[PDB]
Amino acid sequence: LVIWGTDVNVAACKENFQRFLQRFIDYMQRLGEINVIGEPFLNVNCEHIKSFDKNLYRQLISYPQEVIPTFDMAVNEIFFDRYPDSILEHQIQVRPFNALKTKNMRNLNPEDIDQLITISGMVIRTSQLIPEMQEAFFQCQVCAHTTRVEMDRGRIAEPSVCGRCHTTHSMALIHNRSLFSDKQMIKLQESPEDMPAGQTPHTVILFAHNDLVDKVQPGDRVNVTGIYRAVPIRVNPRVSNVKSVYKTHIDVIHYFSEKRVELLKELSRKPDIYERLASALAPSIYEHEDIKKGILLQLFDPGTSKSQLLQYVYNLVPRGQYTSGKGSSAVGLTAYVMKDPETRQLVLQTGALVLSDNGICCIDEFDKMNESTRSVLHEVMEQQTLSIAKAGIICQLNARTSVLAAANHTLLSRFDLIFLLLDPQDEAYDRRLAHHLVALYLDMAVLKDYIAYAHSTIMPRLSEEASQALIEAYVDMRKIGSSAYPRQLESLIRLAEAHAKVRLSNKVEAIDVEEAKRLHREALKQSAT
Amino acid sequence: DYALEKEKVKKFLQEFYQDDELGKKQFKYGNQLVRLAHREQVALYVDLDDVAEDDPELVDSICENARRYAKLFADAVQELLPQYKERQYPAELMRRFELYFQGPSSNKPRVIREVRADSVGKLVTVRGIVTRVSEVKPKMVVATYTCDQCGAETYQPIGRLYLQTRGSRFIKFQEMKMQEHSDQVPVGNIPRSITVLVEGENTRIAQPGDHVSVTGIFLPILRTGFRQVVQGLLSETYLEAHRIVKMNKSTREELRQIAEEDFYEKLAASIAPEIYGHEDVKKALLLLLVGGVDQSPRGMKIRGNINICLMGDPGVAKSQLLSYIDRLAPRSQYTTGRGSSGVGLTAAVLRDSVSGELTLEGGALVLADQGVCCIDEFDKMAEADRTAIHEVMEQQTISIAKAGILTTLNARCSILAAANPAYGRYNPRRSLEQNIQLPAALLSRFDLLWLIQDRPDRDNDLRLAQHITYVHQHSRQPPSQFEPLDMKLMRRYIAMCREKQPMVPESLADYITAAYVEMRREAWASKDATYTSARTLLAILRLSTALARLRMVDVVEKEDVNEAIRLMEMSKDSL
């Protein structure tokens, strides 16, 4: 007795696993927490258990579609015997978390179907609600008996097994308890963030159901486990001629450095990295170092070093998105609202700003933006989220992001900050600039983690060390020629936010606020007439 | 000879892995075999040259019957596994394990036009230029189907039956388009390009535009189907590309007396013959006909781009020369303002019938990887086509941000351009952006701007009269003694200059900045419409950086900087 279609013996490892659930102990705290509280739906990891049992294990991915059932049985064989006088109607289906090291579904085989897998991706979109049919019954004709079909247990969720008598679902389904099924598409996007670039990653035909329905949102970051499925592509549903590729779609079943740090700690100990990294930052160009400064903070004449810098930011960073006006409107950021014309139904069509939540926006051509757009940015920046009240999905769009741009409107007030690329009109500085090029004719990855651990770990606090100083400050910043009683403070703190997001110090003083004075000052001065 | 020597090739293949010690006490081909059964390498290539040294059978024979000696190469490899095995078609039957082919120049990379009725069943290699990059899929090959009443695996390549993946035999495949090189078409014909059959680990491998290898060759999996080549229903032999491989890299005055005298004097007098003088422009064309692509390691990635615009179209029939340029220029394509969409330059996507889902195929720029980019009517490239341009500023600039596809392709070419003037002819009273209308913002970006005022110089007109009137007397358009040349020879005269990869004497570091100071000093001092940048300095450098390619110094010299100055002094109201 065997399943040659998947090569599993009669239960084939079962009685190793029944004892496993009792032998795991050091589960035994969790074994009752499911029955006694009523919280089913196991949530394993990349199963580390492989220290216990390999014959149980190797199977885990292997053809385990015939095993997870036996698990959801074998657990319940034990669990129903554990606490049968609890809420035992809570059947258990497993939901792994940070599963086995997926080979980046971009790369997985044609083979790689009966395979528990996980994403390293990002969401493009969700289904929103479209579940599907569950179970059948037709009517036949000896005084028409209503004949169970997929109501008949043992039969299959095929196509064409339900090719007649729709009310024998479509009303009877209510009258006969098969209330239609349940499945949720999603379009995700594999994205390794430093992909080779050009060649591009794999979006997802997600479909699988469970009432983990919608607990993955659009734009979401991934912690997500699944299993493959696919289906041969007909040349037509009207025919049997065959497109010999199967239409992949996935069973959602989800839920050194210290030495570098010590090196960072030296960089952290190092006192003028604000200057040194500035001396390292955007190194490509000579002066306008002052401009180069705030990118670190913000990390924390056409293209005249500009997109370069923004591309330096683009290059430096996964989290961000470069674009600009004048060919790409707000749509290249957001509010590209439009349909899937193959299906003729609106989609929350958007752009870079939706790529930019907890990110850094590299717009250009800010002069070129419309009022049919740029009223977006009138609204965005005062929000850091974007109300999309639209046809299929009325919502708002958290874009809790960062921005910067430059161009060659009363609301410069908002801006992070941009500066004045003006002419020094000095042949010598040109020569210095020329020399910079004539001379032209690692730190990043260190930086890349320098920025990170603070984005991982650090949380400044501007307390009475220097909370006063802000109060001392905008006094000093307002008063000359007496505005800083506006959110300049909230900018200033957003600048003083940085140096303590630098340095791995969660606490702040005048220095590490005081630098931000010069910045906003010089930024005010250079922007002042 | 073919259908019944099965024992030999199996005997042969039984011994050829044994025919040497080059696979470490095994032949190199057997080196992979232990690596095959251990799943170390799974696909295989074959240098067929190693067989002809002792047995041109299976070399000339496979060349006569690729399919059979493909298919027969497999069926031995089918039963050869147990000899190296570490443990109808049994399940593993080369199921993820693959075979390709290679070897001598008997299979030279052939021309997309030269596929034939002879090319059926043929051993088949090709080079040329790539495009039509499909969305890959996996792809089954064998319906490992179910005899449900009977149990164990059953295989069809093809009612109540089910067809089930668990034992079926799949592959990752694509569509591709090889194209002619734009080099072996000195012709009044279309540079042909081909529907390509694309598979294996040679999918997900490469981008358009590349000059490449191929082997467009049948699979061992089937001879014809159930019988020999004669059949009644048959889909197409198209190009079953095996071993697609990039081409990174394929008349001396010392032995001859050729490059000695200044091409930058001479090459003018032997290029642009019909042209009515104004060789000054031709210099940059000569410079671009040199280009600056092959760089030395100083990071000058913008060296490759000689980004020129020419302003105003029935300027001598300057409309013509771009063909002359393309007649010179390989890796070169011509386009026009409003002739097509941006995919005249860029790329776009939709379904196809033959194979591959939504092949991205691209335009001239996508075709011009480090090419020569030639335009009609730059003004009509309205805002859409103004744009990737304004990216192609930046070299590898065909970027995508679309639902399924978000790549960039390597737009790496260099740009000469023809743009009609703003609805009216050039006018000294009207500016660029008044007599031109395109962005100054772009025009700025161009390495140089040059105009050809069709103006009342009655004597030069009278020369032009003399010029054209000499035409249809003859084709002696440069009758002052210049000996014309073969654009291939010119290309050979070009190529040696391309490979120079010079690098200045840093002591010159003054002389440029020295001058660029005074140059930019005067411009910003003069405060006229002329406006420059640091890209000037690059351009300035970049010119000289090409001037020395012809002035084959391998470094750079004063004169080029003095010449590039003189070019700029010649550029001075070149508009």
Side-chain angles (χ1 to χ4, degrees):
Chain A
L1 302 179
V2 72
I3 316 305
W4 254 103
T6 56
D7 286 348
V8 176
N9 207 359
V10 166
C13 65
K14 184 202 165 195
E15 272 62 29
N16 280 312
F17 173 50
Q18 265 186 340
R19 61 82 171 159
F20 184 94
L21 294 172
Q22 296 140 109
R23 181 255 175 264
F24 180 95
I25 56 177
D26 258 7
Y27 287 1
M28 197 56 54
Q29 60 88 25
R30 194 49 47 96
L31 293 170
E33 273 154 20
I34 292 157
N35 293 121
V36 180
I37 302 158
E39 39 180 40
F41 315 150
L42 173 65
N43 290 285
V44 311
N45 215 307
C46 145
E47 246 333 319
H48 69 300
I49 276 167
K50 93 193 205 164
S51 61
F52 292 102
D53 192 328
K54 183 59 69 68
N55 183 277
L56 276 184
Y57 176 94
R58 180 181 106 262
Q59 295 190 90
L60 64 97
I61 63 193
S62 301
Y63 297 97
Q65 153 64 60
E66 289 69 14
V67 177
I68 301 301
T70 297
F71 278 24
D72 298 6
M73 274 201 287
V75 153
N76 287 254
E77 273 171 344
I78 281 153
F79 274 50
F80 286 10
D81 278 359
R82 275 176 181 289
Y83 298 120
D85 267 347
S86 306
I87 309 309
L88 74 170
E89 277 307 308
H90 289 164
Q91 188 61 20
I92 297 147
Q93 304 91 302
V94 177
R95 314 179 164 176
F97 186 75
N98 284 67
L100 172 68
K101 175 68 210 63
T102 301
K103 278 71 68 175
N104 278 258
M105 59 201 306
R106 157 166 73 245
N107 315 263
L108 289 169
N109 309 338
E111 300 193 351
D112 281 15
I113 307 163
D114 212 349
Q115 293 201 359
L116 278 73
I117 44 165
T118 276
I119 314 308
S120 301
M122 200 200 84
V123 190
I124 305 179
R125 45 173 196 184
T126 74
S127 73
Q128 69 286 12
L129 302 192
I130 306 177
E132 197 42 276
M133 155 179 305
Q134 38 152 303
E135 347 120 343
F137 256 111
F138 283 6
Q139 278 206 92
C140 83
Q141 185 246 288
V142 37
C143 105
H145 180 99
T146 319
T147 63
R148 302 174 292 171
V149 174
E150 287 186 348
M151 184 59 88
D152 261 344
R153 288 281 55 76
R155 284 221 62 202
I156 294 157
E158 310 180 348
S160 87
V161 61
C162 60
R164 207 252 192 190
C165 214
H166 73 270
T167 65
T168 307
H169 303 253
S170 160
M171 297 277 102
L173 186 98
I174 299 86
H175 197 85
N176 297 342
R177 191 72 249 183
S178 275
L179 271 195
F180 282 130
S181 74
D182 263 323
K183 76 169 211 168
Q184 206 188 8
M185 303 280 294
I186 298 185
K187 209 176 174 166
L188 308 173
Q189 180 55 101
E190 170 159 32
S191 187
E193 317 308 335
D194 81 343
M195 203 158 178
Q199 273 206 32
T200 35
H202 271 216
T203 68
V204 151
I205 318 311
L206 191 62
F207 76 108
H209 164 46
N210 309 332
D211 75 326
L212 68 88
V213 163
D214 292 329
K215 326 303 176 296
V216 176
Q217 324 312 307
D220 275 7
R221 184 61 207 271
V222 159
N223 54 2
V224 196
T225 312
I227 309 169
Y228 204 112
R229 265 289 189 191
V231 282
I233 286 163
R234 308 267 287 277
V235 171
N236 204 285
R238 280 41 173 155
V239 310
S240 171
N241 196 348
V242 176
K243 198 191 287 200
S244 303
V245 174
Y246 294 70
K247 196 173 174 182
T248 293
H249 52 301
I250 325 304
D251 279 327
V252 189
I253 141 74
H254 153 60
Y255 205 82
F256 158 69
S257 310
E258 73 289 11
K259 311 267 197 276
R260 175 181 56 69
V261 168
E262 285 287 335
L263 165 54
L264 298 200
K265 277 178 173 182
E266 189 66 21
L267 298 171
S268 307
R269 276 179 285 269
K270 265 214 172 181
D272 60 344
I273 53 156
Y274 182 72
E275 298 79 338
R276 205 177 279 284
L277 307 156
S279 293
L281 260 183
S284 49
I285 281 276
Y286 201 50
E287 302 266 15
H288 308 299
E289 73 301 350
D290 302 345
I291 308 180
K292 298 179 179 200
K293 302 193 167 176
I295 295 294
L296 188 71
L297 309 190
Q298 191 159 22
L299 273 168
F300 265 115
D301 298 327
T304 303
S305 313
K306 293 154 82 179
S307 67
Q308 295 83 344
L309 181 147
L310 300 172
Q311 287 300 109
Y312 198 91
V313 167
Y314 199 73
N315 282 300
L316 171 55
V317 178
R319 281 303 334 277
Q321 184 59 58
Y322 164 56
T323 182
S324 64
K326 181 191 182 156
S328 300
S329 192
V331 298
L333 316 163
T334 180
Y336 185 26
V337 289
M338 212 63 72
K339 70 207 186 180
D340 192 307
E342 319 315 327
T343 82
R344 186 93 201 213
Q345 67 91 37
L346 187 139
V347 192
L348 278 185
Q349 289 287 302
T350 63
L353 264 167
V354 168
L355 280 166
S356 307
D357 175 50
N358 310 317
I360 299 164
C361 206
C362 285
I363 276 154
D364 218 347
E365 299 171 302
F366 211 85
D367 52 341
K368 285 266 192 264
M369 305 288 281
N370 215 342
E371 53 265 26
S372 74
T373 166
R374 206 212 287 259
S375 62
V376 50
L377 290 152
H378 183 195
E379 162 179 359
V380 175
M381 303 192 89
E382 300 189 350
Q383 286 289 295
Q384 316 178 6
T385 180
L386 197 147
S387 178
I388 294 285
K390 276 287 173 190
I393 306 160
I394 304 177
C395 59
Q396 321 92 40
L397 276 291
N398 302 329
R400 298 205 140 68
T401 193
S402 307
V403 178
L404 209 68
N408 59 274
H409 293 166
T410 79
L411 318 180
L412 184 90
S413 68
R414 301 160 286 169
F415 288 4
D416 270 315
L417 242 162
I418 308 88
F419 305 110
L420 273 78
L421 191 148
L422 60 96
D423 190 354
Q425 301 182 54
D426 195 323
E427 49 271 40
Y429 273 98
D430 275 326
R431 159 162 193 196
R432 289 164 173 174
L433 179 54
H435 176 76
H436 195 72
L437 287 157
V438 172
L440 196 65
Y441 310 140
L442 174 140
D443 305 316
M444 306 302 105
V446 162
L447 274 163
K448 186 161 176 192
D449 312 320
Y450 205 105
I451 306 307
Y453 178 82
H455 279 177
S456 190
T457 57
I458 296 296
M459 178 166 72
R461 270 92 79 192
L462 183 37
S463 69
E464 186 53 287
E465 299 93 2
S467 91
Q468 63 276 43
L470 279 191
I471 309 315
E472 310 209 333
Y474 76 98
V475 172
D476 305 314
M477 308 310 249
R478 73 201 192 198
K479 274 180 74 67
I480 310 312
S482 65
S483 315
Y485 60 100
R487 74 167 296 284
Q488 174 161 357
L489 187 84
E490 312 183 345
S491 311
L492 275 157
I493 191 168
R494 266 176 164 263
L495 296 172
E497 260 181 351
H499 300 284
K501 275 282 274 198
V502 191
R503 311 172 72 206
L504 277 55
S505 165
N506 280 246
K507 45 165 202 175
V508 195
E509 74 291 33
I511 294 158
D512 311 316
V513 169
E514 267 173 356
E515 192 66 24
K517 306 164 63 172
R518 295 181 265 278
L519 189 57
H520 198 102
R521 177 156 41 210
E522 295 280 341
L524 172 51
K525 285 194 296 196
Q526 62 100 34
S527 60
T529 295
Chain B
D1 294 324
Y2 312 152
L4 308 182
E5 294 172 339
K6 182 187 263 260
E7 78 286 40
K8 166 51 165 195
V9 64
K10 268 174 172 170
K11 275 165 178 186
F12 176 81
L13 292 158
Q14 272 163 302
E15 186 51 52
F16 187 31
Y17 308 149
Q18 307 321 313
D19 264 337
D20 216 336
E21 65 273 15
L22 289 169
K24 289 267 300 179
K25 283 71 64 173
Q26 183 82 246
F27 180 49
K28 307 195 286 180
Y29 284 29
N31 195 271
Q32 288 143 110
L33 259 295
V34 186
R35 282 224 305 290
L36 288 204
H38 277 176
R39 210 172 61 190
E40 312 192 33
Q41 266 52 49
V42 302
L44 176 58
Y45 74 102
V46 170
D47 195 310
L48 296 163
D49 194 298
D50 308 317
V51 173
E53 294 293 328
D54 73 308
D55 201 355
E57 212 158 11
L58 314 173
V59 198
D60 56 9
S61 89
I62 190 159
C63 274
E64 177 141 32
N65 207 321
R67 305 169 284 240
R68 184 59 59 86
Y69 291 108
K71 181 264 186 208
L72 285 182
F73 181 55
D75 311 332
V77 170
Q78 289 184 17
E79 296 196 5
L80 276 161
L81 168 142
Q83 197 271 326
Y84 292 104
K85 184 51 166 140
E86 87 295 352
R87 181 160 159 154
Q88 308 295 257
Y89 323 112
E92 202 61 280
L93 183 64
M94 303 158 71
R95 187 182 164 198
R96 71 218 166 208
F97 320 83
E98 317 94 302
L99 318 168
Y100 289 69
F101 282 96
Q102 188 262 321
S105 198
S106 66
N107 57 22
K108 206 153 166 76
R110 298 314 314 130
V111 178
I112 290 177
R113 214 199 304 116
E114 280 175 347
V115 63
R116 288 284 163 290
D118 180 281
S119 62
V120 69
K122 186 157 184 180
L123 201 152
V124 281
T125 66
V126 169
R127 72 196 186 279
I129 291 170
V130 184
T131 182
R132 291 273 298 275
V133 166
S134 49
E135 170 52 287
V136 60
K137 294 294 188 188
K139 152 170 193 181
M140 180 179 67
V141 190
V142 168
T144 289
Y145 71 90
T146 182
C147 281
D148 288 330
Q149 307 292 314
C150 309
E153 54 233 41
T154 58
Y155 313 79
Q156 67 198 0
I158 296 97
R160 79 298 181 289
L161 172 61
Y162 295 110
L163 275 51
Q164 311 180 335
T165 55
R166 279 71 57 76
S168 275
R169 188 161 168 169
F170 309 172
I171 48 172
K172 304 188 189 184
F173 83 111
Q174 269 178 285
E175 165 67 17
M176 182 172 284
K177 178 168 279 290
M178 296 312 313
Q179 314 170 272
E180 289 204 80
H181 202 201
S182 89
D183 303 4
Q184 63 273 3
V185 285
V187 302
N189 200 356
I190 282 281
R192 304 289 291 279
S193 60
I194 184 160
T195 64
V196 187
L197 309 182
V198 208
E199 273 187 7
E201 82 297 7
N202 286 335
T203 57
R204 295 197 65 77
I205 48 155
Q207 289 168 4
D210 294 311
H211 199 218
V212 311
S213 308
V214 176
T215 312
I217 181 165
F218 293 82
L219 288 156
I221 64 182
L222 61 96
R223 310 171 284 160
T224 316
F226 180 49
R227 271 318 190 190
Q228 79 301 348
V229 296
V230 171
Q231 274 308 310
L233 173 48
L234 174 48
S235 315
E236 278 71 356
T237 292
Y238 300 149
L239 200 74
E240 291 197 21
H242 286 55
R243 310 302 302 178
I244 299 167
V245 193
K246 175 177 181 71
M247 186 178 289
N248 173 286
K249 188 172 179 182
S250 192
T251 86
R252 287 80 56 199
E253 81 294 21
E254 76 203 90
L255 299 203
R256 282 155 269 197
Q257 315 84 52
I258 310 299
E260 57 188 21
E261 181 174 6
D262 221 344
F263 285 115
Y264 275 116
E265 293 159 336
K266 185 189 170 73
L267 198 46
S270 274
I271 294 189
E274 54 255 13
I275 308 307
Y276 322 152
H278 322 261
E279 299 89 345
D280 54 351
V281 175
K282 206 211 301 208
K283 310 190 173 170
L285 313 188
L286 257 64
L287 202 145
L288 163 67
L289 280 180
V290 172
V293 171
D294 208 332
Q295 70 165 44
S296 71
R298 287 274 161 289
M300 272 201 92
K301 320 312 197 318
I302 196 166
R303 198 171 286 177
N305 194 351
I306 311 309
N307 181 18
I308 303 163
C309 200
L310 322 174
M311 267 49 63
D313 273 14
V316 298
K318 73 189 235 185
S319 54
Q320 174 51 231
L321 51 109
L322 302 162
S323 188
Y324 191 103
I325 299 309
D326 294 307
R327 265 196 299 284
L328 265 295
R331 321 201 65 264
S332 70
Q333 181 144 63
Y334 177 69
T335 49
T336 68
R338 261 277 54 85
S340 31
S341 177
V343 288
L345 290 64
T346 77
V349 182
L350 280 105
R351 280 71 61 210
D352 299 71
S353 87
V354 171
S355 171
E357 281 238 23
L358 295 64
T359 33
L360 184 73
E361 50 167 334
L365 263 297
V366 184
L367 196 72
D369 177 275
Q370 311 172 69
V372 175
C373 285
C374 285
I375 276 162
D376 218 343
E377 315 187 340
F378 206 105
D379 53 351
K380 318 307 199 168
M381 288 206 299
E383 190 65 30
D385 305 351
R386 300 200 159 197
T387 316
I389 284 290
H390 195 201
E391 282 175 357
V392 159
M393 297 309 87
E394 300 178 354
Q395 291 287 267
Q396 312 172 255
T397 36
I398 310 308
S399 299
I400 317 190
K402 175 262 184 190
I405 315 294
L406 301 95
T407 80
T408 300
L409 306 175
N410 307 316
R412 300 201 270 186
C413 83
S414 193
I415 293 165
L416 179 62
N420 284 253
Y423 43 79
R425 220 8 126 126
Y426 166 76
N427 187 295
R429 321 330 315 180
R430 296 179 294 163
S431 69
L432 269 52
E433 277 275 36
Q434 301 169 333
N435 55 27
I436 309 310
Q437 176 268 342
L438 180 82
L442 271 286
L443 291 161
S444 67
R445 310 277 190 159
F446 283 77
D447 68 356
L448 278 164
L449 312 170
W450 275 86
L451 189 146
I452 300 92
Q453 309 174 40
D454 307 324
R455 273 279 181 282
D457 183 3
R458 54 171 201 281
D459 298 350
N460 271 2
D461 301 326
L462 279 153
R463 177 188 66 73
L464 263 74
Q466 288 158 14
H467 202 94
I468 193 165
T469 44
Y470 293 163
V471 192
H472 286 273
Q473 204 79 62
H474 36 64
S475 70
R476 180 165 71 178
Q477 296 156 334
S480 272
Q481 96 317 57
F482 292 110
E483 46 268 58
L485 300 156
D486 194 316
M487 299 161 182
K488 165 49 50 175
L489 284 169
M490 308 210 201
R491 266 158 192 174
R492 191 64 172 175
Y493 299 145
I494 284 151
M496 301 170 282
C497 307
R498 295 185 168 170
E499 298 179 350
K500 297 294 298 179
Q501 319 183 358
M503 183 175 77
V504 315
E506 309 314 286
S507 44
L508 201 72
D510 281 323
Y511 201 88
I512 294 138
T513 300
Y516 185 102
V517 156
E518 306 175 342
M519 190 177 75
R520 181 51 155 279
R521 176 180 73 194
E522 288 282 324
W524 174 254
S526 46
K527 304 148 169 56
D528 58 329
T530 318
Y531 66 104
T532 48
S533 76
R535 311 193 297 281
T536 326
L537 191 59
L538 276 57
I540 284 286
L541 289 160
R542 271 194 306 164
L543 286 165
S544 64
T545 307
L547 297 187
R549 285 194 164 76
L550 296 195
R551 276 159 196 173
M552 292 161 156
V553 164
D554 272 319
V555 187
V556 147
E557 303 297 316
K558 271 200 184 192
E559 286 80 342
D560 302 318
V561 171
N562 294 305
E563 174 56 23
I565 280 160
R566 276 191 298 275
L567 284 178
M568 198 60 71
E569 309 186 338
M570 280 174 240
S571 86
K572 211 164 174 292
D573 309 318
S574 42
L575 306 174

